[PDB]
Amino acid sequence: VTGIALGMIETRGLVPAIEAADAMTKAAEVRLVGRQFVGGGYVTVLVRGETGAVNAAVRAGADACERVGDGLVAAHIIARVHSEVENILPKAPQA
Amino acid sequence: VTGIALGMIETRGLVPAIEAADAMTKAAEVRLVGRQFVGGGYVTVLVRGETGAVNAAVRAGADACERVGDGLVAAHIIARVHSEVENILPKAPQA
Amino acid sequence: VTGIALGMIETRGLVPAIEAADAMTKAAEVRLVGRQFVGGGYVTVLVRGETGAVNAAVRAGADACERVGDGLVAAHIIARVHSEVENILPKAPQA
Amino acid sequence: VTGIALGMIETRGLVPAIEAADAMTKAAEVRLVGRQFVGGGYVTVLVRGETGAVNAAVRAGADACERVGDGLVAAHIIARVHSEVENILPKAPQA
Amino acid sequence: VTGIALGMIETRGLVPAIEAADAMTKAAEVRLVGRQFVGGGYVTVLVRGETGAVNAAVRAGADACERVGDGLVAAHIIARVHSEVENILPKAPQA
Amino acid sequence: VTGIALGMIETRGLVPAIEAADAMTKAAEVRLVGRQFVGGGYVTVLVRGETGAVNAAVRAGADACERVGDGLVAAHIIARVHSEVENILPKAPQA
């Protein structure tokens, strides 16, 4: 609900990205704040939550999406982003 | 009509994606909720329905579209997406 | 004028796509309803008409555009798309 | 001024496309009606004019742009596009 | 706060770009002014600050993001951009 | 200020493009009128000025940006574009 850690998975294609998003949100209490079409085929899903939650989420999403479609590019956690980085992070996705 | 399972096919190009969409919707009672241009040439079609419907649909779409154009990237089902994932799923496509 | 069959050609680049569109529309009575920039360099042109018209059109467009530029990716006909698929098909192109 | 033939050059990148556009418009009396970013790096420039004008233009643009940057993909003329194809052709570019 | 030097990192994918942005902003007093989706999968993050700040920032971001996802494309500093270049530089990002 | 020659550099990525823009504007009296994301990763920067200015600018930008990131695709000058080509040239960039 109120944690500020950031979890991020980037995939080749939207399908593995949606699998990642589902596995992450089912794995721990994290909020899905963005899904971004990057260009070139990259898609990135972003979650916010407490450190431990985001840790468990990212690990789960990564294990899940590497088997789907063109797969996984990156799985990363930043437990406390600098206040400046909030300027580039999505507050809610657009669907 | 009211099922919440999710079916997804991602293709290289729009043509196999439209074949996928037609085969899926003809294969079982599923609703076509989105067609997404991902970037890089990826296109993803998304269907919602009951679990068994989405199962049959995805299987049909996958068999159909792998023979068309540049073909199939991914075919996947999530029978119950986390409530958070609804935030990134299209409610209706844009044409 | 009133036929609901669907003809589709996908090309690498816009130029072969315009050649495809011209050959298809000159080959039989079909309506050009969409030209779509897919991402990655894919372009897809879509025609509607009666079954026989769309058959002749797609065959003509395919023979024509494979010799132009980066060429042909896919040529496909769906003689009756499921009512659900109409949700993703363009009603008129944008130029 | 009033001719309806269509000249088209597709290039890898915008720079050779601008060279193409300049060579075509300097080579014969043709009107520059569109420059289109296709995705994947393809750019297409479109000219309208009388048949002979468009013939000379396309030949000139093609010779000119193949030496610039990533070069030429396609050079093509359609002397009379079907009335349906007008629906997908740009009336004026956007800059 | 008031320095006009420019720091820039370009990455393959958004995830390494967000890592870059975090490392740069944590490394020295710089302002994150832009994150740009370039097409093809390139993402570029831009920081402004005093010369020494931007120097330290870019070095930190570069060391950080080369280990994340598809990695680093470019890391560059322009300590005083020409007044003309301000016309193409983002004033604040969009998230 | 009032010259109509055109200088153009196309790069793989935005970073070398910004280096190009800075080197060109510092090298001679030219105005930066556009920076264009082309798709596929191509970026093109456009300068206007007198012939000699644009000559010196393009040469400087080219030497500068080939060492940055994924580098240089094309460097080109058109000393007097046809009046028709003005229709596709940017009047000012968007940042």
Numbering used by the authors:
A (entry chain A), B (entry chain A), C (entry chain A), D (entry chain A), E (entry chain A), F (entry chain A): 4 to 98
Authors' own words:
However, it was possible to visualize bound sulfate ions after soaking a crystal in 200 mM sodium sulfate. Sulfate can be considered an analog for bicarbonate, having a similar size and a charge of the same sign, though twice as large in magnitude. Difference electron density maps suggested possible sulfate ions at three locations. One of these sites was in the hexagonal pore, whereas the others were at the locations where the 2-fold and 3-fold axes of symmetry pass through the layer, i.e., where two hexamers meet at an edge and where three meet at a corner. Sulfur atoms scatter X-rays anomalously, so an anomalous difference Fourier map was used to visualize possible sulfate ions. This calculation confirmed the sulfate ion in the hexagonal pore, but was not definitive with regard to the other putative sulfate binding sites. In the hexagonal pore, the sulfate is in contact with Gly43, which is part of a Gly-Gly-Gly motif that is conserved across the three CsoS1 proteins (A, B, and C) and other closely related shell proteins, but not in the CcmK proteins. The negatively charged sulfate oxygen atoms are poised to make hydrogen bonds to the backbone amide nitrogen of Gly43, and possibly to the C-alpha hydrogen atom of that residue; the potential importance of hydrogen bonds involving C-alpha hydrogen atoms has been discussed, but their strength remains an open question. The visualization of sulfate ions inside the pores of the CsoS1A layer indicates that transport of small molecules such as bicarbonate is probably feasible. Recall that sulfate (carrying a −2 charge) could be seen bound in the pore, whereas the natural intermediate bicarbonate was not seen to be tightly bound.
The prototypical bacterial microcompartment is the carboxysome, which is found in many bacteria that fix CO2 into organic carbon. The carboxysome shell is formed mainly by the assembly of many copies of a few small shell proteins. Here the crystal structure is reported for CsoS1A. This protein and the nearly identical CsoS1C protein are the main constituents of the alpha carboxysome shell in the chemoautotroph H. neapolitanus. CsoS1A forms a cyclic hexameric building block from six monomeric subunits, as observed previously in the CcmK2 and CcmK4 shell subunits from Syn.
